[PDB]
Structures are given as C-alpha cells and as structure tokens.
C-alpha cells in the first residue's frame, strides 16, 4: 500500500468538526419535499422582529403587568419616567425579548439596536416624552438637561403614537462580549431613559393613567459571532 504517518488529532471525536460518515440505508431516497410557508435561512431574520421588553420587571408586580410602563399626570415638571440598560446579553428588560435570547447563544454581538414605544391610552389624552440614549461614562443622569446632552428623540402623542428610537453603534472596538458585570464593565452600551417633555394632559371624564409598551429589535447592522451556551435551562436528571 501507500506509506503514511499518523499525526496528533488521530482518534479524537471533535464536536464541531465537519467530516463525513458512513451511511446506514443504502440506495435511500427520502420523502419528496413540499412547500411550507415561512422558511428561515439565518438567525438574523428573527432578530429584526419587535418584541415586548419587560421594563417593569420589579417586585410587587403581577404576571402580565410587568410588560407595561405606567404614565400619569405629574405635578412637578421635567420628572423622570423610566430607565433601563441597553446590553442585550445582560439581565433585565432585554431578557424577555427575542434578540436577547438569540444573542445569548452567541458570545460577541455588534450593530445598532431599535426600541419602539407604543402608547396604550385614551384617544383624548395627549402629551410628550423624551427618550434619551446615553453612551457609557457616568451613571444614570439625574436631570433632564443632563439627558438632553446624549442622543434623544422627542415624541408626542397623536394619531400615530408609535415612535421608534434607534440606538446607534457607538463603541471603541468592533464587537462586545455578551457578558457584563465587574471586570466586564468595559462592554456596557449605555442607558436608555424616558423623561416627561411637558406633561400628560387629559380632559375630564377620561382615565388619568395609561401605559407604554416598549419593544426591542436589531437593525441591518446586527452581527453575531462565537456560539456559546445559554444559562436559562437547568437539568438535574433525565426527563
């Protein structure tokens, strides 16, 4: 026969290896394929769909009312309404979404994000809001004039009331590890805050408290790399 030498790597079973195997059924031909609507080709098609964020994930909260941001009439101006971190691979509102559960299978994410705010309230209740994304640096801003120095959008309540704040890609490096906390505070993305521009005005005979639904998705700049495992499932023994 031919002379040959065996090298290191012989007799190993690599998990993520691409190698052929010997078949079991000779001359087999499977069942003919039919057309089923909704064929997916990559996982970036699932990351660009809006999905309700759980911004109200605090305590003293019921099952479903964790998905709503309460808005009501104020007495002092400039008041803050809500705030949450941007990191999708971090515990918080980005964990109930779909881009947060897919970017948890991958280690390094990239690209710009998108947060859509829909106003569930009465037709006669108006108002304005200021949604401000702030890059890393100091902690959550304490005032509204501090938040206006970042990247903000002023959204009023009208016939559409479905605004969408884009979160651009402002990073030093190309990618960011989806592991934050402690020595990994170098990959934080900033804070998205929601303030009150003017107020939540409302006429008589109308409820004085409504809700905002926040949803989150990725953009066409989104990219994912280095497949890892998730930490939502746990198993002691076989089912």
């Amino acid at each position: 026969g031919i002379p040959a030498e065996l090298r290191p790597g012989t007799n190993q079973f690599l998990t993520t290896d691409d190698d052929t195997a010997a078949p079991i059924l000779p001359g087999f031909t499977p069942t003919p394929t039919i057309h089923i609507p909704g064929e997916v080709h990559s996982l970036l098609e699932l990351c660009r769909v809006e999905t309700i964020l759980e911004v109200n994930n605090t305590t003293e909260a019921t099952g479903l009312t964790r998905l709503l941001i309460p808005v009501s009439s104020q007495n002092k101006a400039d008041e803050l309404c809500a705030a949450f971190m941007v990191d999708p691979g971090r515990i918080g509102p980005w964990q109930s979404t779909l881009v947060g559960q897919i970017c948890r299978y991958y280690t390094q994410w990239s690209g710009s994000l998108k947060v859509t705010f829909m106003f569930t309230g009465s037709f006669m209740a108006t108002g304005k809001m200021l949604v401000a994304y702030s890059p890393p640096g100091s902690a959550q801003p304490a005032n509204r004039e501090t938040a206006m120095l970042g990247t903000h959008v002023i959204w009023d309540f009208g016939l559409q009331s479905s605004v969408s704040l884009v979160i651009p890609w402002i990073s030093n490096t190309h990618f960011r590890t989806a592991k934050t906390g402690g020595n990994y505070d170098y990959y934080t993305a900033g804070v998205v805050t929601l303030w009150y521009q003017t107020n939540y005005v409302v006429p008589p005979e109308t409820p004085g408290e409504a809700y905002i639904i926040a949803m989150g998705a990725a953009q066409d700049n989104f990219t994912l790399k280095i497949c890892k495992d998730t930490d939502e499932v746990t198993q002691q023994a076989v089912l």
Partner: protein
C-alpha cells in the same frame, strides 16, 4: 385610502372605517394545491362559494379582569353550514383562512389586545409531575374548544410554557382602542403534509389577549363586546365517505 376598507368573500362583506393594514402571514397567498405536492389519487371537490364566505362566531365579553381567549380554527367550523358538512363527510382538508376581529370602543376608553395565530398551537397541562404515566393532561374541551372558545389560565406563558412577549414572531396585530377598532390576518395553509383531516387536527389557533387592561370613567358603556368573523379562503376536500362528527 388606508383606513377605510371592505372585504367581500362569497356572499358576505366586511366594512371598516378605522383599521390597521391587512397582514399576510409569511408573505404567501393561499392558493390551491399543485399537482407536484399532491399525493392523493381521487379528485377533490371545490365548492368555492358555499364554503368560502364569512362565518361569524359568538361574542366574547370584554371586562376589566379578563385573561384571554383561544380557538382551534379547523375545529371551530365543524358544525356551521356547508363547510362543516363537507369537513364531516370528507376525510382530507386544505384551505387558507382570513380572520377579522372587531372590538370597537369610544374615544374615552383605553386598552390593548394582542391578536395572533400560532401554527400547531399545543395546549400544555398545568401541574408539577415528572412521572409520565400520572401527569395531568388537558381535556377534550380544553384542547378543542370549538365555536364557543376557551379562556386562558396563565396568559403570561400562553398556557404552553412560552412567553407571550416573544409571541410577536407570529403573524399578529394590535387592537389599540385609540388607533383601530379591528384587526385582520390572512393565513395560508401551513402544514408539513399536503392534505390533512379537519376533525382530529387543528392547524393553528387565534389568541386575543388583554395586554393593557380596559379602563374608563364612570358613565361610559361598561361591557365591551368582541366579535370574530372568519373566512376559509380556497377550500379543498377529499375522501368522501360516511359522516363522522369526532
């Protein structure tokens, strides 16, 4: 030219003056089965008028402490009209649907409804039991509600262990009482087999779920009705034999 709309199917029509856009599930239109995907030998029947029209189910009450409702769509129209008779006599079934949900309110009410379809929407059994031969399974009236619907127990997990926050990956719309008073979703025939029985297998299922509760001031109308009108577009039946109900 975008909010007023009229949908005529068969001998039935549906007009609306405020609405969202018409959704098309997965960008595919429901059409007849081609001769390539088909496998049954006998020729199917196509009424195309008597079975493709708008069937209206009963009205569900919209209150303050509601949880939600779900239907199994190839099983809700098994007792209504010529579609039900054909689905009882025949053995194979294939059609697309068109689902309209009307829930109108005034300019002083507020709330939100998530209306979506789930292909192969499987009901889970609530209970902590890891033994397979004793665990609790849902009843026949829980899995197949019929033309009277069934309410949820935990809308936070869709009664299936799946978070309803991510239920926006399905074809869906929102009934927001300040933007639209109705929702519409056209669905093709989504299945891994060309023909299937319309008796012991329900393709998909609608779910109306109160996300933002219904709130109003004293004096306004309290009970808000909810109606759903559906249309089996492009129906095909096969395998004619004795009539069976279930």
């Amino acid at each position: 030219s975008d909010r007023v709309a009229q949908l005529t199917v068969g001998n039935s029509s549906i007009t609306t003056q405020e609405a969202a856009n018409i959704v098309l599930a997965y960008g595919e239109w429901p059409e007849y089965c081609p001769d390539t995907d088909a496998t049954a030998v006998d020729k199917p029947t196509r009424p195309d008028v008597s079975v493709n029209r708008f069937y209206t189910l009963d009205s569900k009450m919209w209150q303050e402490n509601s949880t939600g409702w779900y239907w199994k769509f190839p099983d809700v129209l098994n007792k209504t009209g010529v579609f039900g008779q054909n689905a009882q006599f025949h053995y194979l079934y294939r059609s697309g649907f068109c689902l309209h949900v009307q829930c109108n309110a005034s300019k002083f009410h507020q709330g939100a409804l998530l209306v979506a379809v789930i292909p192969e929407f499987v009901i889970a059994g609530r209970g902590s039991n890891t033994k397979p031969n004793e665990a609790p399974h849902p009843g026949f009236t829980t899995t197949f509600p019929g033309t009277t619907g069934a309410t949820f127990h935990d809308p936070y997990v869709l009664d299936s262990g799946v978070p309803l926050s991510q239920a926006l990956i399905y074809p869906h719309q929102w009934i927001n009482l300040r933007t639209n008073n109705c929702a519409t979703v056209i669905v093709p025939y989504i299945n891994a087999v060309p023909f299937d029985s319309a008796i012991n297998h329900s393709n998909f299922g609608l779910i109306v779920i109160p996300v933002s509760p219904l709130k109003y001031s004293s004096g306004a109308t309290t009970a808000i009705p909810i109606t759903i009108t559906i249309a089996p577009l492009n129906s095909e039946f096969g395998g004619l034999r004795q009539a069976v109900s279930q």
